Design a protein around this ligand. Structure first.
Ligand SMILES: [Mg+2]
Ligand SMILES: [Mg+2]
Ligand SMILES: [Mg+2]
Ligand SMILES: [Mg+2]
Ligand SMILES: [Mg+2]
Ligand SMILES: [Mg+2]
Ligand SMILES: [Mg+2]
Ligand SMILES: [Mg+2]
Ligand SMILES: [Mg+2]
Ligand SMILES: [Mg+2]
Ligand SMILES: [Mg+2]
Ligand SMILES: [Mg+2]
Ligand SMILES: [Mg+2]
Ligand SMILES: [Mg+2]
Ligand SMILES: [Mg+2]
Ligand SMILES: [Mg+2]
Ligand SMILES: [Mg+2]
Ligand SMILES: [Mg+2]
Ligand SMILES: [Mg+2]
Ligand SMILES: [Zn+2]
Ligand SMILES: [Zn+2]
Ligand SMILES: [Zn+2]
Ligand SMILES: [Zn+2]
Lengths: 48, 129, 151, 89, 61, 57, 229, 196
RNA sequence: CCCGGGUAGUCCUGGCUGUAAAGGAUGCGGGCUAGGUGUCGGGCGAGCUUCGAGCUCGCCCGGUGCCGUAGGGAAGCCGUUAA
RNA sequence: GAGUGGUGGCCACUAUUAUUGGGCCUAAAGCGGCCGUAGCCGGGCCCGUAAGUCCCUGGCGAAAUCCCACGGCUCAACCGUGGG
């Protein structure tokens, strides 16, 4: 594996896309954004 | 392919000074490399240097003194305003006046201390300490 | 490295740095241009003409004389031929690659199962397309010119 | 967004049960006869604020910075914490 | 040092055995070098340095 | 007053507290003191006396 | 300080040196702690440091960093062994770190304290922080790095009165060397106490490896060894 | 001119190297013969011998140590120690002789002489750790790593080693003043070498 | 599993399928950072020779192996064919 | 300490989302291999331009909220006059 990419000055779009793409591999992020706990909680988000 | 002559020169210098070489040859020369060498010599980081002509781009011959902890190029070349030098110093240097950042301005290539004195900004291109 | 094979051969010419033509060279510019025109009319390629001039007449490259008409530039073989109207219509390396490709296309008609020689054809045509793109950009070829193998 | 909410004026320890810190604070509490820890913590916060202002102004330059520098020195030596010839250091 | 490249080939001033003509030729030819007057062979090409069949007079700088 | 830290004869860098350096009088003249740091000794770097000019290991 | 003078006098008379450096120190040809560094000597007798730096024996100048017990397996059961990690210093400019082993805890502690004296080093102190430019030796004079095992340590100069912003092992080691304020950053597994301690020790040793000019000594207030007011 | 006639140097075989070479020994190599064997320069050997004679004469006589693991070098170092008063260890070097104070023959010298850096690797390794100057005899095959004064010679032959140590002992004696002239030194070269 | 038999298949011609521990378990281009020693292709120099497109030694470029200094690494190990 | 505990949420811890600043031989991870379109990254010198970039100066980005000094409620929390 070579140097981390992209590093160019005018390559912001691809860099933002890369970070957005690999954030979905994070299980904490995916469950909050898709609201997976809310869909199956018998308490419906209540504390009691 | 070759993409950046200035990065090659600085990585070559920092590789050579770690094994105690006394001189180096910078193979693709350019005016920008000459300016960086002049600024480095003014502050005592290198000895004398000279230009040698082949039919190609030319070569630089440099004398080392064992006074460089580290030297490198900055990519990309970030713009910097005349009152923002402190954070780049904290990013690249080890103490509050230890070493120099080398800045390209519309009045020439100079160290960041001279540029801060004149009150102008520019582009960061290298660091040496 | 090599464009497709990624090998790293280094062999080539090692030209000394000189500005003025050597003292022992006695030809003037008129003689050299006469010689170049004569050799071209014998039918040699541009790369071959310089080889003959170096080998037999003792003339290291003609890129040692200033262009008599335009002082801004030095003299080259293609420029000398342009001054007389004998310069090639298509750039030579493109022509050589096209010639190599045509001969290989008739080999592959009688040998359809020669799959290793076919990859060579594909690489040759990739080189041709790179070259035609470069020449279109610089204006050495018309905008309509196209490489079609059936031509 | 949200309207303003009034915030506490003191800071609590990052770990509640550290032996050395407990010993030091007990010594201070007994000597000066304070009612509870938060009282002590209140004063600690004051000190830190002063320090945080001095660290910021040593590294600043311009016209407003000098005004704030002399204001800090004047406020400190009006309270009786510094001699009348003290410097920012 | 060897920072500047220097060629290992030389230009030679030779004398034809038959015609007596004097010429300047290259030491590493890629073609057959022949006399400019009579047409006899002077240097034969090889993989590297060429085989000289004429009398060598001088090695040019 | 303070004390001065010795400096390598070949490279000019200071000697660290626990490195395998060495020092000795000049073999040829015996009037100057040669210091060699660990890196110079490992790499067989030459040295040169400041008084007589005799050089090298 | 007065007690340690007569302690050093007492040790000096009843000591029979076995090495060359010991012979030099016994004869009085070497009189200060700084004269045994930077010339390639070997240090094999613990009495040298006792005579030259008597205050490393004070209870407040020694620290037991950790105690572990490790097992070797045999057909007749498990054989237990103790490992002790310890450090000493003079709280001014000198510090040492050592490991000792033994069949019981007391033997291991004694050997660990003994080896820490043989591994003594001297460091450089100063002030190099952007928001404190006071020229007094209360911190490191510039950013330094060290490593051991998987642990990487970076030490950063801090303002006066800040404290030691580092884990506890680093706190003790830096306190014994005479440093009051620092920031830090780490990578790796810091719960492995031996590697953490060694990494901090290496970072301190590397202050001698940075090239400096005479202007910088004046600017950062750099002091080598004893502060000496 | 020379410490001995060059005929003597060549007759002892001082100039005979081996099949291999190293980059750092090339300042001493003279030429290479047609069968792949390298030859040493004889004038460099003489000059370095004179310098080494001047250098060792300033040390206290009983603080010099000379070692030789090789069998052909054991007799010359023993005779050299007998003449000059230095300690000599021929044969196996016991590990810890210079690093373990509990060993019976513990001894810390001021300068060491190595007959062959490759064969005497234990002694060199221990000498690096106590920070003393190292003087060694080097062949075309050796490295100059951690050598402070090098004397280029054949360090494998019998007569060669005998002659080298004979000359060095005479130089030490003359420089430190125990004989008033080089000629007064009446001890034959044959007394220095191993017989049969 | 071992022994005696045995269909598809393995082979050729024209097509489809697109899979392997398809592993150097190591994506590709460029600059730089000690040495030592084998072997394959080309070139240069010197010495032999039964005159061979032959043999031995040395140097330059490009492939292909081993041991190893600085450095790297959790270690095994890698180390100008870099990890 | 007039408070002190339990449950659920967000930030920190976390360099477990990494521009600053992570990894991919053996631990998760280099497409079975290669050719090439957009995109990103691109050798040396001379002349021009002034789009990016840097400096100076006009018109704007409400009030409240944030930081500092001084003044009014016993001090403070709060509120006023000024500077940011
Ligand atoms: Mg709303
Ligand atoms: Mg058993
Ligand atoms: Mg390690
Ligand atoms: Mg069967
Ligand atoms: Mg396979
Ligand atoms: Mg060959
Ligand atoms: Mg190779
Ligand atoms: Mg290896
Ligand atoms: Mg957590
Ligand atoms: Mg990770
Ligand atoms: Mg693959
Ligand atoms: Mg794979
Ligand atoms: Mg491609
Ligand atoms: Mg460019
Ligand atoms: Mg503009
Ligand atoms: Mg507003
Ligand atoms: Mg009032
Ligand atoms: Mg008030
Ligand atoms: Mg208000
Ligand atoms: Zn003729
Ligand atoms: Zn050195
Ligand atoms: Zn001298
Ligand atoms: Zn300070």
């Amino acid at each position: 594996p070579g140097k981390k990419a992209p590093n160019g000055e005018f390559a912001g779009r691809k860099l933002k896309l890369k970070r957005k793409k690999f954030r979905w591999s994070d299980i904490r992020y995916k469950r909050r954004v898709l609201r997976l706990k809310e869909k199956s909680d018998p308490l419906e988000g209540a504390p009691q | 392919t070759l993409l950046d002559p200035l990065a090659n020169a600085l990585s070559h210098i920092t590789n050579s000074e770690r094994v105690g070489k006394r001189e180096v040859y910078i193979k693709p020369a350019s005016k920008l490399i000459g300016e960086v060498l002049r600024v480095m010599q003014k502050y005592g980081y290198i000895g004398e240097f000279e230009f040698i002509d082949d039919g190609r781009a030319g070569v630089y011959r440099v004398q080392l003194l064992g006074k460089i902890n580290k030297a490198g190029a900055i990519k990309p070349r970030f713009p910097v305003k005349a009152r923002d030098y402190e954070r780049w110093e904290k990013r690249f240097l080890p103490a509050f006046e230890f070493g120099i950042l080398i800045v390209s301005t519309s009045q020439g290539v100079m160290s960041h201390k001279e540029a801060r004195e004149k009150g102008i900004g520019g582009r960061l291109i290298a660091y040496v300490y | 490295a090599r464009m497709h094979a990624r090998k790293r051969g280094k062999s080539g010419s090692k030209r000394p740095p000189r500005t003025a033509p050597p003292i022992w060279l006695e030809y003037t510019v008129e003689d050299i241009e006469n010689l170049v025109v004569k050799l071209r009319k014998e039918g040699y390629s541009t790369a071959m003409i310089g080889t003959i001039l170096r080998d037999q007449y003792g003339i290291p490259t003609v890129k040692l004389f200033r262009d008599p008409d335009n002082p801004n530039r030095k003299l080259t073989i293609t420029r000398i031929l342009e001054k007389h109207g004998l310069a090639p219509e298509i750039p030579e390396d493109l022509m050589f690659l096209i010639k190599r490709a045509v001969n290989l296309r008739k080999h592959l008609e009688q040998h359809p199962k020669d799959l290793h020689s076919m990859r060579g054809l594909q690489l040759i045509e990739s080189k041709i397309r790179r070259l035609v793109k470069y020449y279109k950009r610089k204006g050495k070829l018309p905008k309509d010119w196209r490489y079609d193998p059936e031509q | 967004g949200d309207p303003k909410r009034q915030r506490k004026k003191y800071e609590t320890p990052p770990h509640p049960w550290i032996k050395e810190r407990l010993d030091r604070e007990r010594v201070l509490m007994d000597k000066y006869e304070l009612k509870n820890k938060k009282e002590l913590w209140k004063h600690e916060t004051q000190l830190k604020n002063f320090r945080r202002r001095a660290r910021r102004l040593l590294a600043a330059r311009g016209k407003q910075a000098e005004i704030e520098r002399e204001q800090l020195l004047a406020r400190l030596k009006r309270l009786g914490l510094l001699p009348e010839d003290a410097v920012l250091d | 040092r060897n920072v500047i490249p220097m060629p290992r080939s030389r230009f030679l001033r030779v004398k034809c055995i038959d015609c007596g003509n004097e010429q300047i030729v290259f030491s590493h030819p890629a073609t057959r070098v022949r006399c400019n007057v009579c047409g006899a062979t002077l240097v034969e090409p090889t993989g590297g340095k060429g085989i000289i069949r004429a009398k060598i007079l001088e090695v040019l700088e | 007053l303070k004390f001065e830290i010795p400096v390598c004869t070949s490279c000019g860098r200071e000697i660290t507290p626990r490195e395998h350096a060495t020092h000795f009088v000049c073999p040829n003249c015996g009037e100057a003191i040669i210091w060699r740091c660990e890196t110079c000794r490992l790499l067989a770097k030459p040295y040169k006396c400041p008084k007589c000019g005799w050089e090298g290991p | 300080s007065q007690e340690w003078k007569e302690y050093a006098k007492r040790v000096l008379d009843e000591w029979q040196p076995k090495t060359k450096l010991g012979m030099l120190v016994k004869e009085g040809q070497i009189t200060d702690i700084h004269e045994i560094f930077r010339k390639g000597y070997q240090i094999k007798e613990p009495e040298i440091i006792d005579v030259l730096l008597p205050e490393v024996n004070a209870r407040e100048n020694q620290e037991i960093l950790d105690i572990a017990l490790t097992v070797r397996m045999t057909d007749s059961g498990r054989r237990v062994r103790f490992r002790v990690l310890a450090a000493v210093g003079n709280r001014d400019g000198y510090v040492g770190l050592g490991i000792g082993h033994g069949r019981e805890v007391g033997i291991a502690i004694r050997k660990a304290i003994n080896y820490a004296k043989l591994n003594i080093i001297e460091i450089k102190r100063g002030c190099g922080s952007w928001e404190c430019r006071c020229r007094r030796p209360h911190s490191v004079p510039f950013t330094v790095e060290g490593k051991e095992g998987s642990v990487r340590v970076k030490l950063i100069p801090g303002p006066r009165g800040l404290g030691l912003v580092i884990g506890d092992v680093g706190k003790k080691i830096l306190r014994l060397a005479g440093i009051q304020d620092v920031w830090s950053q780490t990578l790796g597994e810091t719960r492995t106490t031996v590697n953490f301690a060694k990494a901090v020790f290496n970072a301190l040793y590397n202050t001698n490896k940075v090239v400096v000019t005479p202007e910088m000594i004046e600017r950062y207030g750099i002091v080598v060894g004893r502060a000496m007011p | 001119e020379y410490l001995v006639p060059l005929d003597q140097y060549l007759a002892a075989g001082v100039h005979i190297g081996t099949q291999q070479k190293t980059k750092d020994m090339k300042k001493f190599i003279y030429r290479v013969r047609q069968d792949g064997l390298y030859v040493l320069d004889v004038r460099k050997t003489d000059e370095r011998l004179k310098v080494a004679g001047k250098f060792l004469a300033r040390f206290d006589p009983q603080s010099i140590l000379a070692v030789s693991v090789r069998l052909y070098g054991q007799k010359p170092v023993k005779k050299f120690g007998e003449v000059t008063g230095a300690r000599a260890i021929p044969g196996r070097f016991l590990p810890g002789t210079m690093t373990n104070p509990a060993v019976k023959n513990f001894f810390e010298p001021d300068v060491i002489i190595i007959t062959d850096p490759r064969a005497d690797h234990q002694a060199m390794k221990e000498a690096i750790e106590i920070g003393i100057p190292i003087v060694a005899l080097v062949d075309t095959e050796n490295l100059l790593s951690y050598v402070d004064l090098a004397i280029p010679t054949n360090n494998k032959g019998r007569k060669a080693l005998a002659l080298i140590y004979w000359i060095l002992a005479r130089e030490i004696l003359y420089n430190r003043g125990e004989i008033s002239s080089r000629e007064e030194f009446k001890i034959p070269v044959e007394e220095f070498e191993m017989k049969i």
